[PDB]
Amino acid sequence: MSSEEGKLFVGGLNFNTDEQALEDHFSSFGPISEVVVVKDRETQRSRGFGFITFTNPEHASVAMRAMNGESLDGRQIRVDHAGK
């Protein structure tokens, strides 16, 4: 992305993954500018893919560093930094 968005790409999201679930855990790892999660509109259950925006690429970098392929809600997710 080459931008100060700090957006990370999370894959394999847990079914019980939400904007708050992702924001809370990723917040702990680093600042969260914004959070977005793709889920079922009829089941309201995460589909295994979501987007998370950080304050700065540096913050985005820490989260993927501490979460890439790491058990999120008991299910490993892959955080590929959109920007960094």
UniProtKB/Swiss-Prot annotation:
GO terms for biological process: positive regulation of mRNA splicing, via spliceosome; positive regulation of translation; regulation of translation; RNA processing. Keywords: Cell projection, Cytoplasm, Methylation, Nucleus, Phosphoprotein, RNA-binding, Stress response. Phosphorylated. The keyword Cytoplasm applies. Its main location: nucleus. Residues 6-84 form the RRM domain. It is found in: Nucleus; Cytoplasm; Cell projection, Dendrite. GO terms for molecular function: ribosomal large subunit binding; RNA binding. The modification Omega-N-methylarginine is found at residue 47. Induction: Up-regulated by hypoxia. The keyword Secreted does not apply. GO terms for cellular component: cytoplasm; dendrite; nucleoplasm; nucleus; spliceosomal complex. Cold-inducible mRNA binding protein that enhances global protein synthesis at both physiological and mild hypothermic temperatures. Reduces the relative abundance of microRNAs, when overexpressed. Enhances phosphorylation of translation initiation factors and active polysome formation. Interacts with RPL4. Associates with the 60S ribosomal subunits in an RNA-independent manner. Associates with ribosomes. This is RNA-binding protein 3. It comes from Homo sapiens (Human). The gene is RBM3.
